[PDB]
Amino acid sequence: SGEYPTVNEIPVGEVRLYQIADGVWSHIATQSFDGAVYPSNGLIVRDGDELLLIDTAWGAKNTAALLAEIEKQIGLPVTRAVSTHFHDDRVGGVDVLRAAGVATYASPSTRRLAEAEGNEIPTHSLEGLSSSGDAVRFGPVELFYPGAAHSTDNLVVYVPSANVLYGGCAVHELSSTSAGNVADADLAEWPTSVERIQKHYPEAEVVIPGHGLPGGLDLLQHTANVVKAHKN
Ligand SMILES: C[C@@H](c1cccc2c(-c3cnn(C)c3)c(C(=O)O)[nH]c12)N1C[C@]2(C[C@@H](CN)C2)OC1=O
Numbered sequence: 001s002g003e004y005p006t007v008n009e010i011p012v013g014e015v016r017l018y019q020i021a022d023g024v025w026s027h028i029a030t031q032s033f034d035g036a037v038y039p040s041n042g043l044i045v046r047d048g049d050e051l052l053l054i055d056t057a058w059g060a061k062n063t064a065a066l067l068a069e070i071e072k073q074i075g076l077p078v079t080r081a082v083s084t085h086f087h088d089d090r091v092g093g094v095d096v097l098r099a100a101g102v103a104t105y106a107s108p109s110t111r112r113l114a115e116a117e118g119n120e121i122p123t124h125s126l127e128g129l130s131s132s133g134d135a136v137r138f139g140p141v142e143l144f145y146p147g148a149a150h151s152t153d154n155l156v157v158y159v160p161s162a163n164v165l166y167g168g169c170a171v172h173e174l175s176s177t178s179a180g181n182v183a184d185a186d187l188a189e190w191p192t193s194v195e196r197i198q199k200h201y202p203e204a205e206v207v208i209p210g211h212g213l214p215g216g217l218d219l220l221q222h223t224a225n226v227v228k229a230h231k232n
């Protein structure tokens, strides 16, 4: 009923959209992993009479449900998708997307890691993102590689028309008490990577984490704080 949808509010298999700004939505889905249920976010950005998708909905069936929810709520075709790192909450569902006419993209680093680990593999490589601080345009967004954080390949996405910063899993929600799933993280570099984001996007108005509630710029400092304390 208008609040940001939360883990116990979304059954696994269902997807909800949330309007962030004009032409910008997040998508929210839930999934089971190692016997616990988690929410996760992605992004939808209007690209003329088409849509750009950022990240899958964490699984094939969730991603099919995402496409159906987009058709119901927005009614414009998803033509391209970008996955912001190699984990299943970002690429699981890429095969569904490809079979539904969506061209799927990720950095070469993400594609290599997905392949090596047995995750679904985006079709197209995004060059120009291999060095921290790199940025490239992709339709209505800018893609930025901040350096290693949650993963070595994590990308962030900025929507300049709306000053929306989608941090993906390199950015944690304000209620977070831990650095999330750190299996593939670089806790030592993470605060430096967040500092790069802060420097590059000082006018961000909305910051969206990979999991949990959007907020403002304070999500970036909070993330640095909880990663440093985790490492400690
Ligand atoms: C799919 C994703 C994942 C699974 C379950 C929980 C989380 C969370 C999370 C947990 N708590 N909160 C608040 C968020 C985050 C996050 O932090 O992005 N990702 C998660 N995987 C799995 C993996 C690959 C490794 C294989 N050995 C383990 O690593 C990840 O990230």
Ligand SMILES: [Zn+2]
Residues within 6 Å of the ligand: 085, 087, 089, 150, 151, 169
């Ligand atoms: Zn991850």
Ligand SMILES: [Zn+2]
Residues within 6 Å of the ligand: 087, 089, 169, 210, 211
């Ligand atoms: Zn994640």
